[model samples]
Target: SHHWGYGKHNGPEHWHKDFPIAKGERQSPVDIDTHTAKYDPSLKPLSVSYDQATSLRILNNGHAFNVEFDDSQDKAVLKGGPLDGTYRLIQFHFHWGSLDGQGSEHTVDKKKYAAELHLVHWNTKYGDFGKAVQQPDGLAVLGIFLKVGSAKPGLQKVVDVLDSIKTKGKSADFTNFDPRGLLPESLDYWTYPGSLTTPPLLECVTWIVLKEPISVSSEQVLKFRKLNFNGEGEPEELMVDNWRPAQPLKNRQIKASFK
Candidate 1:
């Protein structure tokens, strides 16, 4: 099996070399031609309520900084947004660029953004996420675009901990934080069936991408750039531009949750 990454031999373009599903239908991070996206009035407003204290640790996983959450309980749950059953919160991470900041995975109307935040959740009907992922109805990831502007105070807490986990495999306590604070005021979104942006490139995600982007100062974004792409002291590879380029949408219909 090929261990994948955003590298010359392992980037998205070459993913088909390892996991054949990378070239399959419903591949994620597809370019959304908003003009062709249908607005479905049947979709309900997203119901996202998380317990502020569910977060456990923040770690720099080489690819991105992930804030892991305690999903042993049903405290943090998402429903009502183009969904049928409850999806439990698991963790969240961001993808950004080194200098230009056009590192978002999915683009709207072929327009890429400065960065993207992914809040990963698992459907409870399948029990443990390990098993949920094996089934078709397994995951739901909420992707929020980030633009450079005024600093988002809620995100500052996440940024403050990055220095502690600046190297690969490093982690620190990330407690008492509420991810809900980072969400935009409007929940208007575009949704579709897609695969995980990374390997094993699993075809099991129900993606919900917000229509609006939250603000973050340029200096704050540079903090994410400080993370080492390579492991500690193993030659300096400053982590940035960690994102998958858009894939083909195939037969899937991109639907807007708003009118």
Candidate 2:
């Protein structure tokens, strides 16, 4: 009734039990202490190929642009890119804090960043995304942290579209936009096996969090924080705080790939 899972009653502890794997392993919000390079020198670096057919479309989902990618046109960009399977581009979104101070998952040395971007992908090799959710390697999420520094050139592309969905329950049409342009030049990342940070936290994900965070102007982050889910026919105070606090790292080793 009051923003599901935001308060004490339905917190993360209650959400973890909703799944089996999440019950045992330590979830995110892990301290980035162990810096071990886990990439195999013999294996080739992983990359993604650019295809117009695999382009993205923006949906004015009231709160933010729910970016969806065309998975049917996906092509592998790396030599040994996890599994040779058909992975569909699902939805991509962002998480930010209320104030300008914090709002990022997996803080470094207890320091919170400005915002975080999650690019979610589902493997069609296991059937539909729902079926893939149960498999160990079903979902692949690319996490990119954003800091408050210089205005991000990449962000300018999406800012103009924000006016269309200024209020809740209000959405506008968007087309011919490339979401891949949001990605930074450096591909260096930390890879690990983990569960979804949200409710019904499924462990069928391979998390690839970037080591170096991208920069965005303070103004850009403010746009996201200003969004609210309660308006007209929309739910009450839905966009107040969309982030979950960090969970413990149950002795799980997080690995990084270095180029």
Lowest summed lDDT across 10 adjacent residues in model 1 is found at: 1-10
Give candidate 1 misplaced runs (Cα > 4 Å). none
Judging by lDDT against the true structure, name the best candidate. Answer: 1
**Largest TM-score belongs to which candidate?**
1
Q: Candidate 1 residues 142-195, lDDT tens each?
A: 999998998999998988888888788898998888998889989999999998
* Alpha-carbon lDDT, every model: 0.87, 0.65
Runs in model 2 with CA error above 4 Å? Answer: 1-26, 34-43, 53-65, 75-86, 166-170, 231-240
Residue 97 lDDT in candidate 1: 81
- Residue-pair clashes per prediction, in order, are 0, 1
Provide the clash count, candidate 1. Answer: 0
